[PDB]
Design a binder for this molecule. Structure first.
Ligand SMILES: [K+]
Ligand SMILES: [K+]
Ligand SMILES: [K+]
Ligand SMILES: [K+]
Ligand SMILES: [K+]
Ligand SMILES: [K+]
Ligand SMILES: [K+]
Ligand SMILES: [K+]
Ligand SMILES: [K+]
Ligand SMILES: [K+]
Ligand SMILES: [K+]
Ligand SMILES: [K+]
Ligand SMILES: [K+]
Ligand SMILES: [K+]
Ligand SMILES: [K+]
Ligand SMILES: [K+]
Ligand SMILES: [K+]
Ligand SMILES: [K+]
Ligand SMILES: [K+]
Ligand SMILES: [K+]
Ligand SMILES: [K+]
Ligand SMILES: [K+]
Ligand SMILES: [K+]
Ligand SMILES: [K+]
Ligand SMILES: [K+]
Ligand SMILES: [Mg+2]
Ligand SMILES: [Mg+2]
Ligand SMILES: [Mg+2]
Ligand SMILES: [Mg+2]
Ligand SMILES: [Mg+2]
Ligand SMILES: [Mg+2]
Ligand SMILES: [Mg+2]
Ligand SMILES: [Mg+2]
Ligand SMILES: [Mg+2]
Ligand SMILES: [Mg+2]
Ligand SMILES: [Mg+2]
Ligand SMILES: [Mg+2]
Ligand SMILES: [Mg+2]
Ligand SMILES: [Mg+2]
Lengths: 126, 253
RNA sequence: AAACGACUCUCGGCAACGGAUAUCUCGGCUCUCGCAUCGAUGAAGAACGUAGCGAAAUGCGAUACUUGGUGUGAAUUGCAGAAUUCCGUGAACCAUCGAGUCUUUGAACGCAAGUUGCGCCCGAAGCCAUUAGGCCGAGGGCACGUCUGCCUGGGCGUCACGC
RNA sequence: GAUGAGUAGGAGGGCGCGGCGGUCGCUGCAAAACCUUGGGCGCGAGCCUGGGCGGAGCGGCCGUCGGUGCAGAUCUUGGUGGUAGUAGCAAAUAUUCAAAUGAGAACUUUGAAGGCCGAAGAGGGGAAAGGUUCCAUGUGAACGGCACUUGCACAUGGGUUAGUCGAUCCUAAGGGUCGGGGGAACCCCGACAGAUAGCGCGUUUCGCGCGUACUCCGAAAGGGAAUCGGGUUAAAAUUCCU
RNA sequence: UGCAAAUCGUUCGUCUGACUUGGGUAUAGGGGCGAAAGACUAAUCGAACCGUCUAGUAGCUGGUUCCCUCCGAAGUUUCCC
RNA sequence: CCCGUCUUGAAACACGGACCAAGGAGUCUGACAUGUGUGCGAGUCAACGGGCGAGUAAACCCGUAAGGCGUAAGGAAGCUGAUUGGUGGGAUCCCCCUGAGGGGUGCACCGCCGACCGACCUUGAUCUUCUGUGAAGGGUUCGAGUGUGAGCAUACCUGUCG
RNA sequence: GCGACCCCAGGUCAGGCGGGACUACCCGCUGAGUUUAAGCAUAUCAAUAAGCGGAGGAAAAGAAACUUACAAGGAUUCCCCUAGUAACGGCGAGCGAACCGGGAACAGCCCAGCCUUAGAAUCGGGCGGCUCCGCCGUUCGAAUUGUAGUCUGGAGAAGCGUCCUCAGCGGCGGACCGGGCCCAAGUCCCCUGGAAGGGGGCGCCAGAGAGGGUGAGAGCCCCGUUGUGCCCGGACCCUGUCGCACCACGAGGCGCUGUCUACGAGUCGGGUUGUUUGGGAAUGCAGCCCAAAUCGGGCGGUGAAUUCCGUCCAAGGCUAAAUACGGGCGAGAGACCGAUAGCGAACAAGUACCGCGAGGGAAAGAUGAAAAGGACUUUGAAAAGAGAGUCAAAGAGUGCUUGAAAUUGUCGGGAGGGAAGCGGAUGGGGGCCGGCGAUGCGCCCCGGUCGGAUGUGGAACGGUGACGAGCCGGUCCGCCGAUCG
């Protein structure tokens, strides 16, 4: 049960906030869980999805597919993967949008900031 | 309740005037001007599109009620008495087939429980867990417009745990379990003792609260300590067993 | 010979016309709570501009859908192009604010106004001109009523000293 | 056992809609809504159900609440008929022939003929008013009350060049003001209750002499400094070139 | 149910003056203006137009939404601008 | 005979109604009143406020000589302020006898007549601060009074009124 | 002619101040009528709407020239009550306070005048310094037609005693506020599905089952929620502690006094006029006339005279809190509305559009999970049609969830001498209905399965009684007989 007086349980307000979230907030909203091996290694549960991350889909028609992320369309709330595509009536190939919550991260693109965020996340869990 | 009412100016933000008779149209006031779809249309009427409703709702409606304290206490005592009848508790929809005895009085050690898992184990031990499980399983989305009015989920009512120690941790331990409600013996609420106005709430008493009941509600002979000058009401019938009276020796002779 | 057909009417299937019904909702209405912050240091309002590709809405002011600092940490995206030691002074139609820019007006202030109309003053730099002044002009000034102080003045208004 | 009329009106018991507190359920093996010469229950308000469609929710029961039940109000908003392929298309004398283009020509363009406006024009320019309607190219839909290949429509581009033409300057009827006088104040009168703006001469930039309380707005027809030929564009010219 | 919320056709009055007309300017609602018709004052005039008081008040006109069941009238008395 | 309406009278040569969908009109609030349900009862009412408390607009608790209504009325006012009944019917119950009987009991309500309080009138021993008191005795007068309380709070329908 | 002062004039002189904007609350002025009175004029509407001004976060009011008549209260403000009361009113319609009492909050103060005269001890500007919201030095100026200090009626001045009280800085925390970072649990097996988030099974977290998103009802997929931990910045105010110097000249407190004791004028008050109020021989306010006093003056709700009594001290000023709040910024909620509803506006809405102008003022939301937004063939001038393709679905094809009625086309059935429709009764035709309409039961023979006492032991248990004894009793299991159902 919510107790903080500065947070609202209003459905209208929650939906408005989610759908008007700016890009920085959308990055956090577009988080995905880590695979079992990465979870065990880093003591972290979920991470924001990055462009160069390796991702395995776990829901939908592409449940078995995996590949590198190639675009994070925050405006559309989706990500695009290397070979997860489809053919149009024209015959040309187009990537299929996948929601990050429906995928699993198998390999992270690590930099100084990514390592610092991983350490911060692991510290609280202990 | 929270008051509701339409805007007092709604349907009156126009300078509309009646055309009068002689134009082969109704006498309802009509918007002035021209060059727009609104011009010439009716206004100010409860039967007019975009008009003012009949008898607009107002905030100074009598929302609240002032019931005598004695009647409130009568209702609370009646609900408490009904909670001790297994037939009424079953009739109210509670699964009490596995309860050892009613009223259900448990050891005061339950008041020190801190974890929801331990609270669940205590419920299983005392036999009140089937009712909580039924309440959890009944979780569903509210039908109708209420689901979009910030009342999305409805469910059945589980046990009500009455404790007698201020600041006990069992409130925290139990508050997350669906259907389970908690209350202090000194501030019992009729809304929880008789949900929906129906008697026979399933209640789990701590020993301290059960002991304090006598000092709170007194008795027929002596007065209450916590309620100044209050005495429990008496029924019009001393013995409600009608068969015993009707088939007694005196009447049948 | 009032049969077949046409017409009218009627019932049914299908197809039209129209947008009712049902399910929705980043909107409204109502109640409650916290805070006290516009302007001559030029407010509110009003005009004109500004994007590679925009008319409106939103934003902004010739540094013009943004400059700068800080935080976050890899986008924006309708299309095209360009960045980014992407293990980093570092993307972002990201967030936030301390630095900075902020056109014509408007209480609007040199005079006006159906006029980008009509005046006066100071002056950086530059041209040749030399203890001399000229051309040009970046840029900035010149409303009213008042307060304190000051400068320059008027009147036998009240006096005094001399002639 | 007796009995049965009912406008105005009163009351009782019930049906139906949407929420709230409870309770019992249904639903992607298909909810709501809607559709149906399917079937049934009730005197009735209504209710239950088959089939279809629809594609995400809904219902029964006990209390309780309300912006809760329509055939009318020349009722409101929206939608739709008969009228009806009907009334109409008729003022301003008038068109015809051949060819070109085009899917399509009575209506576009060329030529020829026959007519009209008849110089106080149906010609050639301006003021106000409009604001791109101006010029070139192209054109699906709409519009041009028939039609269009077309165009004052639509789309993409282009176009308005001044020392001499005007505004700008002056003042007209008048307007707006200082001070003063009124006014609770918004404001009223308007040079009328008053130490005016300043203007000339020589200069150590100071002196001398004049100085009647608005040096403001008000005319693209009043007054008024100055340009003429010739040529030039798809569209500008006393403005561009000489 | 017009080309037109005043027009069209023929006819008709005056036509150097109390003539006609453009622009500027002044007079604004119980006010203006009127060779005077209660005329005109933006299709509005015996008191313009716009917003508000305002959901103005009406003994008067029109409507007033489900079912069954029971009971069931009055147009007469007195007083009242 | 076409519905709705006004009407003594409508199928009317009486008015509205071309057709369909959706919207569309005795409501909320304040003061009273009868009735009914509920609590308590010579009392009743904690929600002005305070203490708290579902981490909480709810619920719970709190009346000190608080306050409202009731518990006393009559007078313009000064002011005074209920001596506590009787009787005819009458429900229920108890006795004797089984008649439409007799005796006891006599609530509610109704009829009649006393008494008490007060306005007015009348009356007057004794005391008394000299203007008060009141032994006795009253009245075709008047009251929204007394004679062993019946209210207070709250819910709803109906009715008058703003 | 010079000088001093006074009044005034000009300065683009040096440095400051003001105008206007917003509307919910707040302060001042001005000010109706509709309406009610069943007419209407006083009255009511209303000390309201409209109009003209002025502030803040609150404003205004505020420290008795008060309330009362008591055994007395003690600034202002607000709530309950007083009370629909006293009073006012063509005493009609109507209107209508205040004191006491109970609560919320509380807070008191500053001036003018007689009182330095051994010297204006006061203040502003320039300039130069400093630990710079200020202090110091110097110089000009203001001011004696009075700046400082003391004093304000509760007092106070002066005098004498008491020895009772009074003097800052800096550090570290607490309190308040605003922010930043991390931290629980499944996406395990089977099925239907385009997609599980649906059903079934097996697990887990919970001081987190508020809420939202994701391809359908998601506690454990994601953001969040609960509760800790850590980090950053304001406010220099309140609060605890610590380190150092802590000076009583002077000023306050207390007691005494054969002395003084200064207090607001065209103001109070009165007459009259108008307005307002419940204020009634006149409640306040304002115009005009008159016009005070200091052993006095105002009030004491009936005018006037006389004698007492009670209570305060106007005509100068400041002041937080309790209270108000349809505007601004920022939040939380709802038995509210759900696109003809709800604000006029869910959308480039105060927009398009209308009016010379003041002003008036709409309509308009929904493809799909994902554009995967329909390639290509063919006919046509083209719009498009017929095929074909995408999708779970085009029976979802960009004004794209669903798609009622009025009204219309087509096919099929039927009827029709100047309406149609309708009530009641049959009939012809059609349509529909198999709970539309049964096939069991009893007695015997054969065969197959399952159990068979009132006997004997065990398990648990019940009726009654007294949730004791005693009596009685059913279910299940194991055996000897019985040989039945
Ligand atoms: K048909
Ligand atoms: K920035
Ligand atoms: K000019
Ligand atoms: K339900
Ligand atoms: K059906
Ligand atoms: K209900
Ligand atoms: K062509
Ligand atoms: K003046
Ligand atoms: K003047
Ligand atoms: K001119
Ligand atoms: K030339
Ligand atoms: K008028
Ligand atoms: K009448
Ligand atoms: K009628
Ligand atoms: K008719
Ligand atoms: K009482
Ligand atoms: K009397
Ligand atoms: K000085
Ligand atoms: K002084
Ligand atoms: K004094
Ligand atoms: K004084
Ligand atoms: K006076
Ligand atoms: K006195
Ligand atoms: K609207
Ligand atoms: K569909
Ligand atoms: Mg709908
Ligand atoms: Mg409603
Ligand atoms: Mg001529
Ligand atoms: Mg052209
Ligand atoms: Mg002046
Ligand atoms: Mg001039
Ligand atoms: Mg009392
Ligand atoms: Mg103040
Ligand atoms: Mg009372
Ligand atoms: Mg008080
Ligand atoms: Mg100084
Ligand atoms: Mg679905
Ligand atoms: Mg999580
Ligand atoms: Mg139809």
């Amino acid at each position: 049960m919510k107790y903080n007086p500065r947070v609202s349980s209003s459905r209208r307000k929650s939906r408005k906030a989610h759908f008007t979230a700016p890009s920085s907030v959308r990055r956090v909203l577009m988080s995905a869980p880590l695979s079992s091996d990465l979870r065990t290694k880093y003591n972290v549960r979920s991470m924001p999805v990055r462009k160069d991350d390796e991702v395995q889909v776990v829901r939908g028609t592409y449940k078995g597919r995996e590949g590198k992320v190639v675009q994070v369309y925050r405006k559309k709330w989706v990500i695009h993967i290397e070979r997860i595509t489809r053919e149009k009536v024209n015959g040309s190939t187009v990537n299929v949008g996948i929601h990050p919550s429906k995928v699993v991260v198998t390999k992270l693109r690590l930099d100084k900031d990514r390592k610092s965020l991983l350490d911060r996340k692991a510290k609280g869990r202990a | 309740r929270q008051p509701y009412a339409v805007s007092k100016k709604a349907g009156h933000q126009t300078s509309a005037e009646s055309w009068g008779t002689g134009r082969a149209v109704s006498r309802i006031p009509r918007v002035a001007g021209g060059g727009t779809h609104r011009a010439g249309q009716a206004a100010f009427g409860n039967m007019c599109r975009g008009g003012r409703m009949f008898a607009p709702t107002k905030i100074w409606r009598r929302w609240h009620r002032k019931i005598p304290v004695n009647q409130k206490r009568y209702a609370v005592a009646s609900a408490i008495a009904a909670s001790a009848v297994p037939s009424l508790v079953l009739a109210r929809g509670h699964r009490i087939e596995s309860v050892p005895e009613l009223p259900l009085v448990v050891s005061d050690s339950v008041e020190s429980i801190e974890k929801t898992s331990n609270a669940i184990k205590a419920l299983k031990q005392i036999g009140a867990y089937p009712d909580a499980e039924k309440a959890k399983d009944s979780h569903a989305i509210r039908p109708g417009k209420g689901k979009m009015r910030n009342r999305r989920y409805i469910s059945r009512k589980g046990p009500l745990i009455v404790y007698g120690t201020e600041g006990a941790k069992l409130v925290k331990a139990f508050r997350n379990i669906p259907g389970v409600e908690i209350c202090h013996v000194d501030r019992l609420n009729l809304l929880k003792l008789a949900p929906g106005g129906h008697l026979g709430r399933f209640i789990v008493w701590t020993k301290s609260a059960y002991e304090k009941l006598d000092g709170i509600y007194g008795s027929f002979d002596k007065a209450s300590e916590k309620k100044k000058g209050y005495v429990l009401p008496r029924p019009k019938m001393a013995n409600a067993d009608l068969a015993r009276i009707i088939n007694s020796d005196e009447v049948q002779s």
